[PDB]
Structure formats: structure tokens, C-alpha cells
Design an enzyme around this catalytic site. Structure first.
Site, PDB file in Angstrom:
ATOM      1  N   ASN A  34       1.111  -1.482   0.326  1.00 16.45           N
ATOM      2  CA  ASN A  34      -0.174   0.109   0.098  1.00 16.45           C
ATOM      3  C   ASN A  34       0.690   1.243  -0.176  1.00 16.45           C
ATOM      4  O   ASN A  34       1.596   1.013   0.767  1.00 16.45           O
ATOM      5  CB  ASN A  34      -1.035   0.373   1.211  1.00 16.45           C
ATOM      6  N   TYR A  68      -7.162  13.255  -3.258  1.00 18.55           N
ATOM      7  CA  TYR A  68      -7.566  12.202  -1.628  1.00 18.55           C
ATOM      8  C   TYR A  68      -6.256  12.955  -0.720  1.00 18.55           C
ATOM      9  O   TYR A  68      -6.008  14.024  -1.370  1.00 18.55           O
ATOM     10  CB  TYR A  68      -5.948  11.231  -2.075  1.00 18.55           C
ATOM     11  N   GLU A  77     -10.582  11.040   5.962  1.00 17.47           N
ATOM     12  CA  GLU A  77      -9.812  10.346   4.329  1.00 17.47           C
ATOM     13  C   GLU A  77     -11.162  10.778   3.885  1.00 17.47           C
ATOM     14  O   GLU A  77     -11.590   9.560   3.217  1.00 17.47           O
ATOM     15  CB  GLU A  77      -9.357   8.891   4.497  1.00 17.47           C
ATOM     16  N   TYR A  79     -11.631  10.390  -0.767  1.00 14.40           N
ATOM     17  CA  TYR A  79     -11.017  10.159  -1.629  1.00 14.40           C
ATOM     18  C   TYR A  79     -11.797  11.653  -3.276  1.00 14.40           C
ATOM     19  O   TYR A  79     -13.602  10.940  -3.095  1.00 14.40           O
ATOM     20  CB  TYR A  79     -11.478   8.828  -2.755  1.00 14.40           C
ATOM     21  N   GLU A 170      -2.429   5.781  -5.667  1.00 14.63           N
ATOM     22  CA  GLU A 170      -2.523   4.365  -4.332  1.00 14.63           C
ATOM     23  C   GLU A 170      -2.706   3.197  -4.957  1.00 14.63           C
ATOM     24  O   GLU A 170      -3.288   3.414  -6.115  1.00 14.63           O
ATOM     25  CB  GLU A 170      -3.682   4.604  -3.619  1.00 14.63           C
TER      26      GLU A 170
END
Length: 183
Positions: A34, A68, A77, A79, A170
Site C-alpha cells: 500500500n 485524496y 479520509e 477520495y 495509490e
């Protein structure tokens, strides 16, 4: 134009990203775990109109090309996903946003004791996921205000403290390459 460079790995796989000039970055990764690599702004604004051009978005497996970022208070968080590889991220469905020519599904998710900008926390995820992959190699534009406001409309208000805001690449358990200029 950008002022912030984001280069995060979980130490798994091999992930080489280059902080090129201006808003341009490249990242090559092999058998990654990741990573979140991108360019943008130390402080996110709910009104910023981001533009980007992805020269390559070539993931062999899972990988997101997203707007992001993070808020605090609450710890969110977020996106805006324009491109993905083998898996489209989904979460709890909330509705759609339609901004910059494309329609995005709106998702929420809870991450339990995940890695966050404030340590190990159980935080919240806001998701804007395009229903089809946007075009790569084109000058693309995400008008954030559209997503922030439609998220408001479904109950997803963002925090008061704005952290970084980047056009991130990502990858999760995959290999590939990406060339992205942000401005």
C-alpha cells in the site's frame, strides 16, 4: 500550482516515486502493499479546482488515481476517484455526484484502527468514485467544491481542520506505473 509532496509506503513491495519539477510526479511499483504518492497542497481547500493530466495510469491490479486528502474534527479520509485498475472501490452507497462531466457514486466507509494522519485511529472515509474510468492522458479537472457540497447533501460534512490535498496514486497489492502532473 502545487506546494506539497506526498510519498508514503507501508514498506511492502518496491515503490519508487520521483518528485519531479512543478506538479509532476512519476511512480513505478512492483508487488507493492500500500502506498499513497502524489502532489498537491499542504492545506486542502473545499473550493480548490484541481487539474491534472495522467501521462500513464498503468496499474497491474488494484490502484487508484484519486483526489485524496484528510480533514480533522472529524478525522475524515476523502477520495475523489477518477481511475482505478482491477477493482473499483466501493463502500456504503449514498448517492451520486456529477461534476466535471462525469457522474460519481458517493460512498462512506469506516476504517477501524487504520493508519491515519493522526496515528492509529478509527476514522471515516468519504468516497467519490466515478462510474467509469476517466480518460488518461487528457487534462482533467476535479472541481472539489462540487464533491464537498454534494457530500454535504448526503450527510457527509467534512472536518474543520484541513490537511493535505493531493492527486494521489495509490496501489494496493499490485504493480504498475503512473505519470501525473498536478496543477
Amino acid at each position: 500550482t502545487t506546494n506539497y509532496w506526498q510519498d508514503w509506503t507501508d514498506g511492502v513491495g518496491t515503490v519508487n516515486a520521483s518528485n519531479l519539477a512543478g506538479g509532476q510526479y512519476s511512480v513505478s511499483w512492483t508487488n507493492c502493499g500500500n502506498f499513497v504518492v502524489g502532489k498537491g497542497w499542504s492545506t486542502g481547500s473545499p473550493s480548490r479546482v484541481v487539474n491534472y493530466n495522467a501521462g500513464a495510469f498503468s496499474p497491474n491490479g488494484n490502484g487508484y488515481l484519486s483526489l485524496y486528502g484528510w480533514t480533522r474534527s472529524p478525522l475524515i479520509e476523502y477520495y475523489v476517484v477518477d481511475d482505478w485498475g482491477s477493482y473499483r472501490p466501493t463502500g456504503t452507497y449514498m448517492g451520486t455526484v456529477t461534476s466535471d462531466g462525469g457522474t460519481y457514486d458517493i460512498y462512506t466507509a469506516t476504517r477501524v484502527n487504520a493508519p491515519s494522519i493522526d496515528g492509529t485511529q478509527t476514522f471515516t472515509q468519504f468516497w467519490s468514485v466515478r462510474q467509469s474510468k476517466r480518460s488518461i492522458g487528457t487534462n482533467n479537472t476535479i472541481t472539489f467544491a462540487n464533491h464537498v457540497n454534494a457530500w454535504k447533501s448526503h450527510g457527509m460534512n467534512l472536518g474543520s481542520s484541513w490537511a493535505y490535498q493531493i492527486i494521489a496514486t495509490e496501489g494496493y497489492q499490485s504493480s504498475g506505473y503512473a505519470n501525473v502532473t498536478v496543477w
